[PDB]
Amino acid sequence: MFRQEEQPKTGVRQFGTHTTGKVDHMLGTHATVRPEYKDPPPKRTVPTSQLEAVRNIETQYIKARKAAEDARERQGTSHLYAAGKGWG
Amino acid sequence: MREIVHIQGGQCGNQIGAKFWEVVSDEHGIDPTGTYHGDSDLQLERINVYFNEATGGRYVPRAILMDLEPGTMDSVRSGPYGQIFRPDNFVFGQTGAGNNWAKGHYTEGAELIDSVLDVVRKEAESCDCLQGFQVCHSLGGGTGSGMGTLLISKIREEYPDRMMLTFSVVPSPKVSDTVVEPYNATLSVHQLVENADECMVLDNEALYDICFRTLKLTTPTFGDLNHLISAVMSGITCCLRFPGQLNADLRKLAVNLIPFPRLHFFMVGFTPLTSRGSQQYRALTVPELTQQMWDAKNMMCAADPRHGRYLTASALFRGRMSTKEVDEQMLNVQNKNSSYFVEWIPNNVKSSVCDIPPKGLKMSATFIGNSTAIQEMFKRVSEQFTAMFRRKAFLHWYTGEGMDEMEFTEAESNMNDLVSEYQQYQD
Numbered sequence A: 001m002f003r004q005e006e007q008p009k010t011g012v013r014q015f016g017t018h019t020t021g022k023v024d025h026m027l028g029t030h031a032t033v034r035p036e037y038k039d040p041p042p043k044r045t046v047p048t049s050q051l052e053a054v055r056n057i058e059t060q061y062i063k064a065r066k067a068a069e070d071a072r073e074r075q076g077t078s079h080l081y082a083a084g085k086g087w088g
Numbered sequence B: 001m002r003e004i005v006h007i008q009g010g011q012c013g014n015q016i017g018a019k020f021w022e023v024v025s026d027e028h029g030i031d032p033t034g035t036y037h038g039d040s041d042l043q044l045e046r047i048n049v050y051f052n053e054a055t056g057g058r059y060v061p062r063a064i065l066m067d068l069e070p071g072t073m074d075s076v077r078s079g080p081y082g083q084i085f086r087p088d089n090f091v092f093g094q095t096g097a098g099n100n101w102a103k104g105h106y107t108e109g110a111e112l113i114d115s116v117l118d119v120v121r122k123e124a125e126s127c128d129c130l131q132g133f134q135v136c137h138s139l140g141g142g143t144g145s146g147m148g149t150l151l152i153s154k155i156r157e158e159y160p161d162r163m164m165l166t167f168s169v170v171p172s173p174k175v176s177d178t179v180v181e182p183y184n185a186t187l188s189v190h191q192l193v194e195n196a197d198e199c200m201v202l203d204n205e206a207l208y209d210i211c212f213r214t215l216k217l218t219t220p221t222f223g224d225l226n227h228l229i230s231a232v233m234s235g236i237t238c239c240l241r242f243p244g245q246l247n248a249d250l251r252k253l254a255v256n257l258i259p260f261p262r263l264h265f266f267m268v269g270f271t272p273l274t275s276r277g278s279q280q281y282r283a284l285t286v287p288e289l290t291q292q293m294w295d296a297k298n299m300m301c302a303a304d305p306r307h308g309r310y311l312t313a314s315a316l317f318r319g320r321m322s323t324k325e326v327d328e329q330m331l332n333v334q335n336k337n338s339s340y341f342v343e344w345i346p347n348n349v350k351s352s353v354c355d356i357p358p359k360g361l362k363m364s365a366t367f368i369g370n371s372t373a374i375q376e377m378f379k380r381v382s383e384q385f386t387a388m389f390r391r392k393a394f395l396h397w398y399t400g401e402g403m404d405e406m407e408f409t410e411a412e413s414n415m416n417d418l419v420s421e422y423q424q425y426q427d
């Protein structure tokens, strides 16, 4: 109806939504933390399975960590009350 | 609908609180995830006393895990029955007391006592009718004894009508995990004689003796020791969570077992403890339970009961049973040895029957004893204190923070007054 043209894109170089400054942790959820943005586990206690998988063989470090975990489990066992079963 | 707010303090208390919730959530039918999977209907009648309702049928405990080192609470969360607790209740410190009673009570516990009071205020206001606050800690520690007793002092000024049950682990006679155990113990009992309504005295070598000569365990661990004290904690509240023939709340144990306001230090004991070989052979009968329960070996305190007189004792029986074998067996133990019982209080033994036994047992019993024979334990701790305080060793950490050397005198003064009043009822 008229000779209609496009305005030129004259503006500042805009960064995407993936940057750490413009990231919205609650996007479209009405002030609730979005999924896959989880709370940090305390002290990041890695399981020994990943350390087994990284190395080829169960080395001395792997065996020492296994021994420490086994000692912790043996200390945690009550030997009078089974987990999920009654005394004895 | 009488709720208990559990507050765990220190490395021992968080470890013994984790083991305590392993026997409550399992017996109430709570899975490790948190939902309900109980096979009976009697559990869901009383869940509110130790759990809060949540979305999706989840039940979260009324537990406040209090510590000054983060190395204890991360172990509780990572263990079994561990992620049931709220993340807000997991209150933590950074510096850590380091087995110093002084630092927990005054300096580095002052900026945490406000952060633990509002959690307790939020929990206590949420429930409608409190029965009391239950705590579990040690007295030889620095985190659970120093800042733990500061919590008891500031919760009694807030709620002066509600009860207090302190499952306190005293320093052991034979062994000592910490050098400054006599300093921390005497200052912790200085608070506990006034503000605490009741005190449950536990000793490690008492637990070690039970696990050795009664349970026949070759190598007990701390998990063995924690779950025996956990059996007592579940045994006191067995009436609150379940109906019985003769009901008995915590305050029914308060009126019976306490003659005078300073007579609130009790010694505990869980009755049916057998080795794995001896489970099948020994018949589980009520006079057999009575014979084991009054024994000095089975009782869970290092003070020997034969050296003094029971001022008042109480027995809490759990399971389907008849009243007489509870009844005249408590009469039998008053007449067979009347010297071991006090004279001016007739019918010293209190009894109660609960209809729901703990898991894996047809019958069980739990003992509470207000003996004057526990003066030997407090006199022994005072003996170690006066040995150290005369030469004034291990004091520059205490007096270097802002407490005076005069304060140690009043800690010993009412310690000697606590055994002074224990002596004048034994005679």
Ligand SMILES: Nc1nc2c(ncn2[C@@H]2O[C@H](COP(=O)(O)OP(=O)(O)O)[C@@H](O)[C@H]2O)c(=O)[nH]1
Residues within 6 Å of the ligand: B009, B010, B011, B012, B015, B016, B097, B098, B099, B100, B138, B140, B141, B142, B143, B144, B145, B169, B171, B176, B177, B178, B204, B222, B223, B225, B226, B229
């Ligand atoms: N029942 C029990 N007692 C423990 C355990 N670990 C340590 N203790 C006791 O706690 C005392 C040491 O106190 P500590 O743990 O440092 O107390 P905290 O400073 O308040 O954390 C020792 O005398 C032990 O007898 C446990 O797993 N179970």
